[PDB]
Structure formats: C-alpha cells, structure tokens
Design a protein around this nucleic acid. Structure first.
Length: 69
DNA sequence: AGTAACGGCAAAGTTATGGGTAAAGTCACACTACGTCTTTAATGGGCAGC
C-alpha cells in the first residue's frame, strides 16, 4: 500500500486546499460527549464526567450553580 | 363483467410494566443530645397524747 499511496499522491497531486493543521481548535472540534450530554454543577465539586469531577472558575457564579450544562 | 367501497386476517407498532447494568447525584464524616421541671399518692420516720 505505501508505494500505491505514493503513486496516488503523484498522479492526483496533494490538494493543499484540504490541508488542515493539527491545532487545538481542531482538537476541540473532534470531541465526543456523554450519553446524556449534560452534567450538573455542584458547589465546589464541578461537573461529574466519567466518574471524574471537573472544575472551572465560571462555575462560581450563583446563576449557573446547581444546574445542568 | 370491471371498478370502488366495505370488512376480515394478520403482522407491525404502540404504550406500558417489571427487570438488568452503568454512571450521575446525595450527603455525612467533620466532639455532642438525652436532659429538666412538674405532678399526686403512699409511706415512713419522729413527736406527742393517752
């Protein structure tokens, strides 16, 4: 397959218009979610995803606290 | 005799209900409740009269 792939890129070119860098934004664009897709924000704890709690400063707001996001 | 409407057969679908696992959600660990005042009735001493 490797030489066939090289021949394919030789005949068909490279098509640089389709080139996408491996930047962090793409990585964010390739992130799956959980089945429910929402997690509730506990006081101090954060959001429980896959048995693991995650925290951000934005959770300290009273209006978001104790809610599902 | 051909065609559209009606109805039976049946499978396909729809909620519903009692099970299973897996994961989000709760909450107690943070020294700590048992404690005190009030109530009537019976009884048991000393104290006094016979």
């Amino acid at each position: 397959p490797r030489d066939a792939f090289a021949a394919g890129m030789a005949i068909g070119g490279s098509r640089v218009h389709r080139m996408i860098p491996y930047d962090e934004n793409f990585q964010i664009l390739t992130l799956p979610t959980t089945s429910e897709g929402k997690a509730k924000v506990q006081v101090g704890r954060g959001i429980k995803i896959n048995y693991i709690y995650y925290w951000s400063n934005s959770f300290r707001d009273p209006q978001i606290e104790n809610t599902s996001v």
